[PDB]
Symmetry: C4
């Protein structure tokens, strides 16, 4: 089989609600099912199949191991998948590797799986190519080495991946790894605005360029925006100039005074953001998602911009529709691409966390919206879970 490359996108001018995976709809005390407790879900597709990934706390609902499940990192957390459309339960799932931070992607021939574990002060990125554990990468700032929580991107067999290391409250200067058949064949050190880049959501703008919309957990509600040239293996990063700030928390739209590079206020904390390309013959569409609340992880709106340059564009993104209403959880979001026979379908996935605090179970549904047809986005997504059951 042949290496995959980004293709022209399938025809379409709007996203529509596609699929909800709400495994805790079957988690009642009165029920008989074992959905896995998870967070940081993402989706990645090869030629034939999409897989729904997540980071489990290796516990189920109903169950006795709720405690710790609101936590980020421990020695039990694993990267798991199911084929997309299956409920990720104890039995349907496969456990790929120990991980408290993840990524995966298909290169046309095989699956690369990425999982970070280790102690906070010296963590370790591991790479699996199919069945074989294949390579590692070491902590360079000795402070919670970390990856995308979304799909890596492969072209001509060469798979690119964002990592970062550093204080979540401070300086976290990201790197990219060029990976081929599961082995690291180079490190790319971005230039430009590089002081804090987290959890990049990356995809192909063309055969020459990968672009990522990332999270600054410390200094700004603007998303750092990566442009990675895969011909030269060089990357530059600058803040998104759009007045439609995509992070949460954030201040009012347009309120960050001054030129594109201005950090502004209300920039502490953050959330991973969805971002996907629509590649047309002579026009590029960029689709983004952000929370409906400016302050809390509630709701998710979808946004679009055709052409321009996200580094210098001060104008608003166009609100394309409400995916998750203000009354429903809107947590992490991510882009991915489904492979049709002759073209690529852009989609956004949304993690809808069931959050009842540290004294209950802590897990998530995943909602999916994809480019399809014409017109306007029509319907929002609810999880339907009562956390008391």
């Amino acid at each position: 089989p042949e290496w995959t490359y980004p293709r022209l996108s399938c025809p379409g001018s709007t996203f529509q609600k596609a699929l909800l995976i709400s495994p805790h709809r079957f988690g009642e005390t009165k029920g008989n099912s074992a959905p896995l407790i998870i967070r940081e879900p993402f989706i990645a597709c090869g030629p034939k199949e999409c897989k729904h990934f997540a980071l489990t706390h290796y516990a189920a609902q109903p169950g006795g191991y709720y405690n710790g499940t609101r936590g980020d990192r421990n020695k039990l957390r694993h990267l798991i998948s199911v084929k997309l459309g299956k409920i990720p339960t104890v039995e349907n799932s496969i456990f790929h590797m120990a991980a408290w931070s993840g990524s995966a992607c298909h290169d046309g021939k095989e699956w690369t799986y990425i999982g970070v574990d280790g102690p906070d002060n010296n963590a370790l990125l591991k790479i699996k190519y199919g069945e074989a554990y294949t390579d590692t990468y070491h902590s360079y700032a000795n402070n919670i080495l970390r990856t995308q929580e979304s799909a890596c991107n492969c072209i001509g067999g060469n798979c690119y991946l964002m990592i970062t290391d550093g204080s979540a409250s401070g300086i976290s200067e990201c790197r990219f790894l060029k990976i081929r058949e599961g082995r690291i064949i180079k490190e790319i050190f971005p230039t430009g605005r590089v002081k804090h880049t987290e959890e990049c959501t990356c995809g192909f703008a063309s055969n020459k360029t990968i672009e990522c919309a990332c999270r600054d957990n410390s200094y700004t509600a603007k998303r750092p925006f990566v442009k990675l040239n895969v011909e030269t293996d060089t990357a530059e990063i600058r803040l998104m100039c759009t007045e439609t700030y995509l992070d949460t928390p954030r201040p009012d739209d347009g309120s960050i005074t001054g030129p594109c590079e201005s950090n502004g206020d209300k920039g502490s904390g953050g959330i991973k953001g969805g971002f996907v390309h629509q590649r047309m013959a002579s026009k590029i569409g960029r689709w983004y998602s952000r929370t409906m609340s400016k302050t809390k992880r509630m709701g998710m709106g979808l946004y679009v911009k055709y052409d321009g340059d996200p580094w210098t564009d001060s104008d608003a993104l166009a609100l394309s529709g409400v995916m998750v209403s203000m009354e429903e959880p809107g947590w992490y979001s991510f882009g991915f691409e489904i492979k049709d026979k002759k073209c690529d379908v852009p989609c956004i996935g949304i993690e809808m966390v069931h959050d009842g605090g540290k004294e209950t179970w802590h897990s998530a549904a995943t909602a999916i919206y994809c480019l399809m047809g014409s017109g306007q986005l029509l319907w929002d997504t609810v999880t339907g879970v009562d956390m008391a059951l």
Copy 2:
């Protein structure tokens, strides 16, 4: 692999009881299983395999989410399948897409999946070709856009599908979509008696003609009868003339006074009806199913007519046997075709709803009868479920 075409039917002159799928036989409080709560099941087959589809309420029995499950449309309802012969449970099932109205069919190369969701006033038909979301179609009468709840039909790669839009109590003028590799390549606007057509059950009479037996939810207990010419992509609709009225409710057989086109009385409400062709070298068999009760969704009898013209034939259909006795639920029914090595097996499927009102769970078994051998239909089907358990 090659596109499929309708073939000559396998030899046979009677249907026989084939298979019951009664997932709630494993739904007891005292039990350990998770059958999905569903309705509107149907079956569709490719060359190798049949799939058993249904519209889930995304809830299981036993479970805490019974409430709403008697309802028709909500934001949780999804199109699901299992391979035919598997119990559609939480874990065996795959979730294809968000849908409160569905259809699917195989074209010889791949599966097309159809699901309608959206608000009642502006609903949306979505199309999936394998993994890829592929096209949409918009509400044209802004009143619960709707589809077959049974298999679409593909020939030479071209897959045809009935939709309708309009008041369930009033005018609902249906359309057909010609779909190819998941994309709509034309709309067909039927002529003739077109004031209310719902939930058509369609199949091939030949390589030139698709025929459908549909439901009039407002004006008549006679079934509107579609004839769609796939060479010219044109369709005409007229009422079935048979005295053996196939809808429920209905008046006594023969009691609708006057010529073929007369609407008659007791025509308010309705039920989707099974219908399948037996294609022979020089004779066509049409098999239909209708409820044993004239008024309630109880029982299911099978009926046949060889040759003639359902638009002008006033004679009775021949009662071929009792599939479901008067004492057992007989809800929706549908036709489909199993692909043998060299010929096609016609079958009727019957949805047997467990109905205990809005304050209990609301789901369904599926019974299957197929053409096989000679003689007379021998045995009826019971679900065996006690809804108190």
Copy 3:
């Protein structure tokens, strides 16, 4: 792929304990599993794979549907399988068809499935070739038409199957059906001792002859013994002459006075018996199983005879070992053949029924012994189920 033929058996001179499938070891009230309630298990293999068949009461343990489960025939009973080695549970199982009497076999290219249902006075044998329902056969004595409860046997694409019809207490004159790609291409009417033949266990003695060891439910504890010539499609039946009477109940060995054809006493009732061939270059081995108790369904011993003629041989069979001790249930038993790369492995399977009467659940484990190596049979099989749990 090519049609299968019986081959020379793999080397070996003894059977050994191979595999127990005891699905009710996971059926506790305190447990979380759903093993299917079943009886009449058998096993059949193609080139790649063996399937473990049984007739379910469409109920699980734990569950609310125990009542009726001791019964032989009803409208819920179905033929199911799993790949051999899997626990036949609600979810692992596939439901092939409605059946209260069954058989299956692979012809090298595809699976033929056989299931009888219908009313007692007019029952119906149904045939499925892969997915397609394909043929039927009608009741000829209008009294519980019935089949093998073990594998049919295919050669050169032609699959042979024993059926019978008649009073279980009286005259039940069996027939054979020659089936090809799921269609009956002839009926064979045996000659000879034909007054009562039930539940034949059949296999290949050579490319020319199929042989069966059957049950007489009325007149004798000797097993009727079929020899079917597949070149001429003719069959003759005579009683087994061996003093080692293989039925249960039975009188003491050797106590049936007079010549081979003598019926003797203690012949009322019966049990289906295991029987398998070991085909060697210039010697034929016949392996049989019978209960350790002469009167009750307790224990199972394995027996062998090389060469001779079972119709005229008065000598004892050689006791080869105890498969199930006197203290464990020994119910139906059956032969089958596993396909190695170049040769065929003969095996006997034993149904070990959990019998606590009509007021508890009624189901069965399956024990498997196969030809393997040299020496002497070493270990017996226990089910390990406490029916109180």
Copy 4:
């Protein structure tokens, strides 16, 4: 497909934590899962896939059959597998054969499965090639005939396996079987220090030599060390000379006075030990695991030695890291090899037994560490199970 041969190992200089399979994390009373009760897990891989084997007590947690589950041998114990990464539950598992001692391995074309059962005084090794039961081997010392509890090793189609027979407290003189397409084509009788060899962990040092690190259950805390020449099918055994005694219990490192062959003290009892080769172009790495406690089955450290000769090397092994801390169970350990596209990944697996005595359930998690990247081993493995739940 072609026979497999040992290849050059994938690049790497350290092991890292890869994967935990902790099926009892889903075994709570309050939960809905059925993990199998097991012990003696091991892993074996073919070209495409790794399988996770174990010896079940044919019981689940939660369940009613805990009693006996601390025991070594009974008539219910079976060899089971799942694909590596799946939770071995009642439904995910396949049951290969009755066994209370096991082994498996892939030869490039098919799976060989090994299982010993029988009475203690006359036990029986059985061999399965795919589906077919294929050969047996008899007890030669009439005292619990036994095998590796880890993978056999195939080269050019020829698969080698260690067995032993004899008193666990006394003389147990092991043998090797050369097996080809499931049939024993020779016995190899080792020479040298042969008085007690148990549970050898074997792999390829090269195309010419298999090496094993075994357990002496009676006379020494030094591991007997096998070198098997596959060209000549001859084997010699001597004690490991290293001061880093790999058995448990053991005395202080270096305390066994005298030359390499000295037995020393604290040698009664034992544990099976992990051992895997790293084959380089002109250097051989040997990786071993031993318990952190000198006396109890607690913790697991990983060790390495490059080149030398384990029979004559008195020097210490290099401590490479702590896989399981002193506070966590460290029971059996084993080596295996994952097949990358062009090279072989060495790994160690560790059985982490949940031991609460004979009056609770007795089962095990499996931890996996593999060669991957550079540097130092970073993280230990905990099971996370509270046996009270």
